[PDB]
Amino acid sequence: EACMANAVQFLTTKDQAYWNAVTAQVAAITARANLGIIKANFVTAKIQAL
């Protein structure tokens, strides 16, 4: 019964953990791309003050 109980728990969540990691990886790449926009906007803020 112990093996059967864990088999259902493992199988259901086996794929959920993988795709959560994939989503985090994509967000990290997207955040890095948005970092360049922040640097560009930093110069824009300085110009707007003038």
Binding site: T44, I47, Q48, L50
Partner: protein, 50 residues
Amino acid sequence: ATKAEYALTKLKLSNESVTYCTAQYNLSSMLPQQLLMLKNQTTQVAEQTK
């Protein structure tokens, strides 16, 4: 584009400055001279009436 627009606003001060000097000259010189012109015309109308 913001930097270019900043230069345009900065350069616009020159037009406002010369406009103030132009208006000041008109009040100090042109307007009093026109008043003398109108007074002489007023006298001429009476003479033509005579």
